[PDB]
Amino acid sequence: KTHVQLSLPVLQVRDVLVRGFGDSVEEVLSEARQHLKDGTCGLVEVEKGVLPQLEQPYVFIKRSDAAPHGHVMVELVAELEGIQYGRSGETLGVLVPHVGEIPVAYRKVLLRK
Ligand SMILES: O=C(O)[C@H](O)c1ccccc1
């Protein structure tokens, strides 16, 4: 399937133990996609002071369309040193590895895979 319904645990930035997916745009997009497949991906909602507490390159989920079965359609966009790889809509948050942190909420998304 081209899209997969996922429920992403929303984590507080100060709880996150592993603050990015790796060291290159290509690696972080690869690792994000793997963690989204394996159910080991969390979402941090972006506000003032969040991104400097996480590791670049960043992986964002961004709205790809204006929401089947409650699931917002999203795609992945990476960022390194102020350059974005991908073009998409509003940021829903930044993806990180999930290693057992307790979430504050779930974000229902339909991920373009
Ligand atoms: O196809 C799968 O195994 C799975 O749906 C999946 C989820 C997220 C990204 C890629 C693939």
Side-chain angles (χ1 to χ4, degrees), residues 1-112:
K1 281 184 204 315
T2 70
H3 287 82
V4 60
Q5 278 179 350
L6 300 172
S7 278
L8 299 180
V10 177
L11 311 180
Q12 314 198 263
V13 67
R14 292 183 184 281
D15 286 341
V16 173
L17 298 180
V18 183
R19 284 177 179 268
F21 282 113
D23 300 331
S24 71
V25 162
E26 290 157 79
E27 182 179 22
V28 301
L29 284 167
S30 180
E31 284 293 330
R33 287 191 166 100
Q34 196 58 41
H35 281 77
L36 285 161
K37 178 224 173 110
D38 298 342
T40 59
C41 191
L43 177 64
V44 180
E45 294 184 323
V46 180
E47 292 180 348
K48 293 297 204 297
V50 168
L51 288 178
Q53 297 183 73
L54 299 172
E55 290 171 344
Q56 295 191 53
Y58 310 125
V59 175
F60 299 112
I61 51 158
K62 279 180 167 296
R63 190 196 211 95
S64 63
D65 174 8
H69 316 277
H71 291 254
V72 174
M73 295 192 49
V74 300
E75 59 201 336
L76 300 191
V77 171
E79 178 181 313
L80 177 56
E81 292 160 0
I83 302 170
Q84 288 197 341
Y85 302 82
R87 167 174 215 264
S88 189
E90 194 191 356
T91 294
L92 277 75
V94 51
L95 299 181
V96 293
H98 186 211
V99 301
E101 300 96 332
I102 305 301
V104 295
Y106 287 91
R107 195 70 207 251
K108 293 183 291 167
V109 307
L110 193 47
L111 167 69
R112 186 178 296 172

